[PDB]
Design a protein around this ligand. Sequence first.
Ligand SMILES: [Zn+2]
Ligand SMILES: [Zn+2]
Ligand SMILES: [Zn+2]
Ligand SMILES: [Zn+2]
Lengths: 62, 67
Amino acid sequence: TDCRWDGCSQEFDSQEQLVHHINSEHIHGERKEFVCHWGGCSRELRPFKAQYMLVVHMRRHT
Amino acid sequence: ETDCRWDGCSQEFDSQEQLVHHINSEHIHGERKEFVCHWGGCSRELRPFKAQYMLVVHMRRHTGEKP
Ligand SMILES: [Zn+2]
Ligand SMILES: [Zn+2]
Ligand SMILES: [Zn+2]
Ligand SMILES: [Zn+2]
């Protein structure tokens, strides 16, 4: 019944609430994770909170 | 400098400009082709799915939701 989506502190009473939460916030909600999938990147797939930060980060690989 | 290492991409280019344009066009602003499960302790280890529907079915392993 508790959310373990990295960055999420949400705890619930029931499976049905967790299911609705994950669908609402983490699947269909505003995208808040922007991962660099560059092979050997020292971030190790740790997400940025905004696309702009990923764009700036890509200058390090190019 | 010239070659893309974006997970599941092996485009190689002649110039830095070509690589910069490729990354922006395909990996930043292109159709999304990576769907990561950020569930703590997930055995996938943040390895991406190709499609949103695949992440949706995968979530039922963390929730226990019957299909
Ligand atoms: Zn959550
Ligand atoms: Zn990176
Ligand atoms: Zn690429
Ligand atoms: Zn998972």
